[PDB]
Amino acid sequence: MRECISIHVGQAGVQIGNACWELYCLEHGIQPDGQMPSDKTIGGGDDSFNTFFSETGAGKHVPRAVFVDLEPTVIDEVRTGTYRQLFHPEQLITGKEDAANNYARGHYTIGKEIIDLVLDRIRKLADQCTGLQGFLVFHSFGGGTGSGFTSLLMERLSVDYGKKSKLEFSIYPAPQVSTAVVEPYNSILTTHTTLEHSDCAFMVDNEAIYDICRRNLDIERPTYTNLNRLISQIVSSITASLRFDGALNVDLTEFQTNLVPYPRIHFPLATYAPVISAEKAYHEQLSVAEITNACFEPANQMVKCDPRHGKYMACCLLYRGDVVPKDVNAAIATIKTKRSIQFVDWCPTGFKVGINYQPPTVVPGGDLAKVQRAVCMLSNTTAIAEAWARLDHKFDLMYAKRAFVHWYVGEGMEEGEFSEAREDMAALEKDYEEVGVDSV
Amino acid sequence: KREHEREVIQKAIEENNNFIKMAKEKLAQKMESNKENREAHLAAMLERLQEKDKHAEEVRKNKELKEEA
Amino acid sequence: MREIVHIQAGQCGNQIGAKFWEVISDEHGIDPTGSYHGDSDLQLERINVYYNEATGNKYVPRAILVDLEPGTMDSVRSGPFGQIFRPDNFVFGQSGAGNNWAKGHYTEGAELVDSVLDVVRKESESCDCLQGFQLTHSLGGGTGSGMGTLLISKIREEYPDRIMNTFSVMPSPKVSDTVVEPYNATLSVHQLVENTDETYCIDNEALYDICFRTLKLTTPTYGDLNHLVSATMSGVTTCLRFPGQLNADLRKLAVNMVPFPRLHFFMPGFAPLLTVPELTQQMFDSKNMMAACDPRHGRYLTVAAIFRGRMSMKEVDEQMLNVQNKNSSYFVEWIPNNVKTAVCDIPPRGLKMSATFIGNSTAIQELFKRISEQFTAMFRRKAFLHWYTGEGMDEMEFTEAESNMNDLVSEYQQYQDATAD
Numbered sequence A: 001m002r003e004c005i006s007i008h009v010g011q012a013g014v015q016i017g018n019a020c021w022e023l024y025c026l027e028h029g030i031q032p033d034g035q036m037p038s039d040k041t042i043g044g045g046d047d048s049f050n051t052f053f054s055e056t057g058a059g060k061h062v063p064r065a066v067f068v069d070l071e072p073t074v075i076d077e078v079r080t081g082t083y084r085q086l087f088h089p090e091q092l093i094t095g096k097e098d099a100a101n102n103y104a105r106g107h108y109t110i111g112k113e114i115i116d117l118v119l120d121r122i123r124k125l126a127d128q129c130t131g132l133q134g135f136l137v138f139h140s141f142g143g144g145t146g147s148g149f150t151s152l153l154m155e156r157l158s159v160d161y162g163k164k165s166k167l168e169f170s171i172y173p174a175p176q177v178s179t180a181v182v183e184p185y186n187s188i189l190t191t192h193t194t195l196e197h198s199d200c201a202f203m204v205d206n207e208a209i210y211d212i213c214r215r216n217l218d219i220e221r222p223t224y225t226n227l228n229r230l231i232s233q234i235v236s237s238i239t240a241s242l243r244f245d246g247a248l249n250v251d252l253t254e255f256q257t258n259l260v261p262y263p264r265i266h267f268p269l270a271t272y273a274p275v276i277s278a279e280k281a282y283h284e285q286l287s288v289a290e291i292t293n294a295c296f297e298p299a300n301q302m303v304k305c306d307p308r309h310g311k312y313m314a315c316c317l318l319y320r321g322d323v324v325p326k327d328v329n330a331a332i333a334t335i336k337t338k339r340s341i342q343f344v345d346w347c348p349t350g351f352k353v354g355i356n357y358q359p360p361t362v363v364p365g366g367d368l369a370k371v372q373r374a375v376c377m378l379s380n381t382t383a384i385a386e387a388w389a390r391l392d393h394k395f396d397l398m399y400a401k402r403a404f405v406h407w408y409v410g411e412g413m414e415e416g417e418f419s420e421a422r423e424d425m426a427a428l429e430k431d432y433e434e435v436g437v438d439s440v
Numbered sequence B: 001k002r003e004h005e006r007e008v009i010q011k012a013i014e015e016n017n018n019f020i021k022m023a024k025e026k027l028a029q030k031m032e033s034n035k036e037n038r039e040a041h042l043a044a045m046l047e048r049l050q051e052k053d054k055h056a057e058e059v060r061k062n063k064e065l066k067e068e069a
Numbered sequence C: 001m002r003e004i005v006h007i008q009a010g011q012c013g014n015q016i017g018a019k020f021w022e023v024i025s026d027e028h029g030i031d032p033t034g035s036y037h038g039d040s041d042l043q044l045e046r047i048n049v050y051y052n053e054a055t056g057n058k059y060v061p062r063a064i065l066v067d068l069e070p071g072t073m074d075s076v077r078s079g080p081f082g083q084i085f086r087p088d089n090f091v092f093g094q095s096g097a098g099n100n101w102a103k104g105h106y107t108e109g110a111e112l113v114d115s116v117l118d119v120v121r122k123e124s125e126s127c128d129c130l131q132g133f134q135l136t137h138s139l140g141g142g143t144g145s146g147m148g149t150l151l152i153s154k155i156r157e158e159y160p161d162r163i164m165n166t167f168s169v170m171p172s173p174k175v176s177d178t179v180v181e182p183y184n185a186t187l188s189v190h191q192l193v194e195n196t197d198e199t200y201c202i203d204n205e206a207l208y209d210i211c212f213r214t215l216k217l218t219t220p221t222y223g224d225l226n227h228l229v230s231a232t233m234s235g236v237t238t239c240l241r242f243p244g245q246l247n248a249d250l251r252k253l254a255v256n257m258v259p260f261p262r263l264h265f266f267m268p269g270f271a272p273l274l275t276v277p278e279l280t281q282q283m284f285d286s287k288n289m290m291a292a293c294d295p296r297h298g299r300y301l302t303v304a305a306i307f308r309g310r311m312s313m314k315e316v317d318e319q320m321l322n323v324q325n326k327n328s329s330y331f332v333e334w335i336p337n338n339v340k341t342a343v344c345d346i347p348p349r350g351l352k353m354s355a356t357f358i359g360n361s362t363a364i365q366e367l368f369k370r371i372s373e374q375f376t377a378m379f380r381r382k383a384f385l386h387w388y389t390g391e392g393m394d395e396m397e398f399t400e401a402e403s404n405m406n407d408l409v410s411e412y413q414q415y416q417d418a419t420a421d
């Protein structure tokens, strides 16, 4: 009951999936071979962790996940890696030729050859669920598969599962680790296409994660591995309410009620703390007040933007570890005093709090220190539209000359889809302005 | 009140079914429009390459009519 | 894997083609007998991009050798790595081309093209997932120039959605005295603008100047010029044949480099000919370009850079940002983040660090203006046209080729003067 199916699309989605499931296995005591000695439920059960893992009669705990990519090299590492025995081979789906950073090839030319196989594999996971709650789709904005194939998959999932909730973890492009000049094109196209088919999307700005690794972990030139392990902690915080239970645990869907005031306004801003090296953790114990204060420091945001320049429509605090309400209440009282958190006039201003007592976990060989308590804040601020603005400006610079547009048209797309998608983004920027205007 | 309760749940069902239906139709239209466009672009390319071969033949032919044998 | 099928046509094509396979074979630990004796598993990671694996763990280049005369290919078969090539992939005629584009494209070249396609078709048919073809040839002769573009057209008819990539050697009076080279070159550019996805402009004018002024070679030979070509070809293919994130296949490189389908003619560079700042400054210097063009006379649409060897990636990132910031005037504003940088830990032979430069700059119009200048100097007086009309051609085909290349130049100028606002 309450099962969640995870779908990792393209290189970014797959590698982030490697990090997330490794971290999940460590948090739950699941070995690389899938065995979980602490689970006396052999072959099944209704435990909270069963929302993300099915069980076999042999004692195997298998992620409720599908990995898909249009070329094999990334998923091949999963097939031969440390957790190769964790997944059934049919959960790892690959083609032979990728989308070449071209949304059109992922959504049409190449994606159409494998979409039916992917949907068939997802259907096999669904059939094992007693009460499927929805999907979690991990993907980059900038890749041809992460953008084009994700969009096609999201559209097809709406057809096959109707109103079933679909959440995204979306990798917003940054120049320091970007691979294609046309990534602004692919970002606008997939955002336009999937906007109707997701009711919540967490954007992860690669530049934000890049800066946090450099600044807070003293990593000169962070790699995808550095970035993905930090991303997995944020993903873990967000899904911890689904995978663990407890007296103070608040289900992610209850935060969702507060986070999404209108279908299109469904892009929460995530902030995680503490991100601290082992050298510094050896000296400092970070209290509830300290990590909460960090949530309102823009440097710790998952997306670069200035919430001071916007208005809040919701604010949720997801704690894990050694945290009691008393400490939270005091920390929150201070923050409201020191920081001016401006809400829109049409929604309440009270922070929504959840606490998962299971303490944070870190993977060996990582750079994150192991702390006793951590927090992920999810806020709905109009300032996240600034991320759309930066992307829309690069789109406009290139599109005014039709630069690279022939690669998309050559694959079957029309200019009308570019302008239609860009107009949707302009409407979205306008929608975020309107929701922040006071009532009169 | 019972008939209003029926109409609400019927409307909820109709809204789910209509979301499925509209999504199915939009995707089918994009899939079809894209197949036509790409195939048409390949046809133009090959058609140009065919005109090249046609031209290469009327060039080899032109060399024949330059004979005084 | 993701196979590339390699083709080399004519004297120049086979000369630089052989050197290319010598250099990369050494990089991948393949010896003249096709056996692997390298040391790093990164050598064999993506070996299948350029090599087939025969019986006994033997690696055979996926290469096809074409020429309308046997001479050049015979010396290849007797070269150092001559026995590494598949004997059945030597496809040659006897009559030769006589530096005549018409002969290589319409007459003798057309009588031999089908047997070449049979071998091409045989290599492609045994590819797990063919991604495209690369052709090496000159534009000044007759075989590689005329028959080379013919093969491109015929191949493109049977593989319309695969990537077509060529290394094209532009003619220069400083190297060859053959008088008709401006004709053959323009007729070739006429084809390359239409039927290729990406072309590396290997300019014999720049190769000579590098050898003479930089290397201090009073009397540059073809061997000297070809050392630069193979070093360059090694650089621009490192991303295709080593585990890499950026521009790892022919199509992704094309999508990052070609904002408009006709402007697909690249200005390659190399350095050195030593710190990361020095490597970066040298690879962007006009004197390190393999095309006789100064990038400061135009603007960059896109740029691909690959650094080879062990070095600080933080430093590379800073120097790549620095060279862009301090030279922003030379990068079009309406293509943001148009410079991409790849890194490969495996350096080239002899060097500890190396940087290879691939520029799509509007300054390449200087190369085409030079060819057009030499072309019209002969065409406005209808000089030497009988070599070509005697094969069936008429003055119309020359006129069309002239206007197409002249149009290319104006298109480069159009985007050079374009502005964001």
Ligand SMILES: Nc1nc2c(ncn2[C@@H]2O[C@H](COP(=O)(O)OP(=O)(O)OP(=O)(O)O)[C@@H](O)[C@H]2O)c(=O)[nH]1
Binding pocket: A009, A010, A011, A012, A013, A015, A016, A069, A070, A071, A098, A099, A100, A101, A102, A140, A141, A142, A143, A144, A145, A146, A147, A171, A172, A173, A174, A177, A178, A179, A180, A183, A206, A224, A225, A227, A228, A231
């Ligand atoms: N955070 C993070 N970003 C990644 C990772 N891998 C790729 N990216 C980003 O994703 C974008 C490129 O898209 P990819 O996911 O690599 O491409 P793809 O989805 O496989 O699509 P194609 O390769 O074109 O078929 C760039 O912005 C990369 O910086 C990763 O492991 N972690």
Ligand SMILES: Nc1nc2c(ncn2[C@@H]2O[C@H](COP(=O)(O)OP(=O)(O)O)[C@@H](O)[C@H]2O)c(=O)[nH]1
Binding pocket: C009, C010, C011, C012, C013, C015, C016, C097, C098, C099, C138, C139, C140, C141, C142, C143, C144, C145, C169, C170, C171, C172, C175, C176, C181, C204, C207, C222, C225, C226, C229
């Ligand atoms: N860089 C370089 N250029 C060459 C080589 N051989 C010939 N060329 C050039 O190619 C042109 C002659 O074309 P050629 O290859 O002989 O024509 P083909 O053999 O009939 O196809 C002249 O401009 C030469 O300068 C070579 O080995 N290296």
Ligand SMILES: Cc1ccc(CN2CCS(=O)(=O)CC2)cc1
Binding pocket: A158, A162, A163, A164, A165, A166, A167, A196, A197, A198, A199, A200, B012, B015, B016, B019
């Ligand atoms: C009854 C009903 C309610 C909502 C929706 C639309 N919604 C889009 C976002 S989603 O794909 O995550 C879940 C469905 C359809 C039907």
Ligand SMILES: [Mg+2]
Binding pocket: A010, A011, A071, A098, A143, A145
């Ligand atoms: Mg990929």
Ligand SMILES: [Mg+2]
Binding pocket: C011, C012, C141
């Ligand atoms: Mg010659």
